Amino acid sequence: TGNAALDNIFERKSVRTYLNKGVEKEKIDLMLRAGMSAPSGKDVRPWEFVVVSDRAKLDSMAAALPYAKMLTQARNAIIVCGDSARSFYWYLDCSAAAQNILLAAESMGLGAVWTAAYPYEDRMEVVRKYTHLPENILPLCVIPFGYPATKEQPKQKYDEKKIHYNQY
Amino acid sequence: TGNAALDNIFERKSVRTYLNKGVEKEKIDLMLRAGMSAPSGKDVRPWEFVVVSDRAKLDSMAAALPYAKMLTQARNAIIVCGDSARSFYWYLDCSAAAQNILLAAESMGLGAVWTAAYPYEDRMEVVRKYTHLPENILPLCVIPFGYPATKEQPKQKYDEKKIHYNQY
Ligand SMILES: Cc1cc2nc3c(=O)[nH]c(=O)nc-3n(C[C@H](O)[C@H](O)[C@H](O)COP(=O)(O)O)c2cc1C
Ligand SMILES: Cc1cc2nc3c(=O)[nH]c(=O)nc-3n(C[C@H](O)[C@H](O)[C@H](O)COP(=O)(O)O)c2cc1C
Ligand SMILES: [Cl-]
Ligand SMILES: [Cl-]
């Protein structure tokens, strides 16, 4: 009883190197629409997305973020943020939004990777500085994306030991 | 440039009423496999899933949880938990896992809803009591699921105001 949605979920992987080529505007638009389709605590919809295409900002962030060095080879990144003034579920909602973005990327032949901003205060401040985020808008993650430079197998993470019936 | 993965992301909605009929074992297995395919900070894979099919536990949880009353009409629920001893990203990883489970459910003609345990300490204690969770294993959410009782339109959440280019 498999299907294409499940295949995409199983196929998704973190891609950290990209070809030097742009990404179609229509694909970026669909990734954002995917992000906004996430579930949301009390249906607040606290997400805010910053689409970064400025070479200098991308490179400046790369230098300052410890595990987002691949920003220097990405043409674009989506910064998934939450309006913490509107919801204390923001980082949960925004994690579901981010996962939709990653799934969307995979489904359109792109590669992407979740790089943490939250929970690291210093990283969040980097992102705030370069994208001019109001104080209440907190960055969950920076998602570089592009066409993969080197296709890879997805990870096979199934682990029966992590399934518990009725009690632990 | 749409596709079936994006359609499923757009179609997913919270379903809170279910027909009185069981769910195929193969579907439940695929939902769990979907959950385990989530991305994970440092690839820790801190998720733990409790599949609850015991009528009494389901009903006892329903009584004690303020916004999971639909457990009394669900045959089963998946409790998404994180091993907080293994990862301080647990609630982010597990939110991505939960979103995969919801997407998987939708793709196989099922309905599901994320009901919060975390961040509410009292709810987390309810779940801990009934599923015997070790202290380090923290419950993110309780996901009742089933065949929908009343099909509904998905929510159309696209909001151009939540897209920012380069700076806020
Ligand atoms: C973090 C989180 C917590 C939620 N908590 C509950 C809950 O306790 N009970 C419930 O019925 N729905 C809960 N929901 C479901 C939301 O109400 C639902 O996602 C929102 O109304 C948007 O509707 P949709 O999922 O149909 O798109 C939760 C969703 C999220 C993301
Ligand atoms: C909460 C979270 C934070 C992450 N942080 C980073 C990061 O800062 N840099 C990075 O390259 N990858 C990061 N990752 C990606 C993970 O390393 C990746 O999901 C994991 O290795 C599993 O690989 P997969 O995504 O290919 O299945 C993060 C993932 C999650 C869920
Ligand atoms: Cl696997
Ligand atoms: Cl929409």
Task: Identify which of A168, A165, A118, A163 has the alpha carbon closest to the alpha carbon of residue A143.
Answer: A118
Pocket test for ligand 2, best of A9, A92, A115 (most atoms within 8 A of CB): A115
* Helices and strands, counts by H and E, chain A: 5, 6
User: Which experimental method was this entry solved with?
Assistant: X-ray
Q: How far apart are CA B68 and CA B141, in angstroms?
A: 10
First to last CA, chain B: 28
Task: Identify which of A118, A79, A68 has the alpha carbon closest to the alpha carbon of residue B162.
Answer: A79
Q: How far apart are CA A106 and CA B95, in angstroms?
A: 19
Structural domain boundaries, residue B146: 1-168
- Beta strands B76-83 and B137-146, pairing class: antiparallel
Question: At A60, which CATH number?
Answer: 3.40.109.10
- Residue A43, Ramachandran bin (φ over 0: left; ψ between -120 and 50: alpha; else beta): left
CB A46 within 8 A of CB A86: yes
Specified resolution (Å): 1.5
- Beta strands A47-52 and A115-116, pairing class: unpaired
Residue nearest atom 1 of ligand 1, based on CA coordinates? A41
Q: How far apart are CA B40 and CA A63, in angstroms?
A: 23
Question: Helix, strand or coil for residue A130?
Answer: helix
Residue A86 one-letter amino acid: R
Question: Helix, strand or coil for residue B41?
Answer: helix
Known binding-site residues of A for FMN equal 12, 14, 16, 40, 67, 116, 155, 157
Phi, psi angle pair for A122, to nearest 5° = -65, -40
Classify each residue of B58-79 as buried b or exposed e, where b means 16 or more C-beta atoms within 10 Å of its C-beta. Answer: beebbebbeebebbebbbbbbb
Q: Which of A5, A26, A27 sits opposite B5 (nearest CB)?
A: A5
CB B81 within 8 A of CB B139: yes
H or E stretch covering B139: strand B137-146
Q: How far apart are CA B134 and CA B122, in angstroms?
A: 16
Q: Where are the alpha helices (DSSP H) in chain B?
A: 4-11, 25-36, 55-64, 90-107, 121-131
Q: Which residues contact B109 (CB under 8 A, 6 or more apart)?
A: B147
Domain count, chain B: 1
Q: Which residues contact B142 (CB under 8 A, 6 or more apart)?
A: B61, B65, B68, B71, B77, B78, B79, B115, B117, B127
Phi, psi angle pair for A151, to nearest 5° = -65, 145
Q: Which of B3, B9, B115, B156 to mutate to probe the A interface, most A CBs <10 Å?
A: B9
Using a CB-CB cut-off of 8 Å, the residues of chain A touching B140 are 92
Partners of A147 in beta bridges: none
Pocket test for ligand 1, best of A33, A37, A43, A94 (most atoms within 8 A of CB): A43
Q: How far apart are CA B139 and CA B84, in angstroms?
A: 10
CA distances B152 to B62, B71, B101, B157, Å, are 23, 19, 19, 15
Q: In the block, which residue shows the tokens 């019936």?
A: A165
Residue A88 is given by DSSP the state T
Q: How far apart are CA B99 and CA A47, in angstroms?
A: 15
Q: How far apart are CA B72 and CA B57, in angstroms?
A: 10
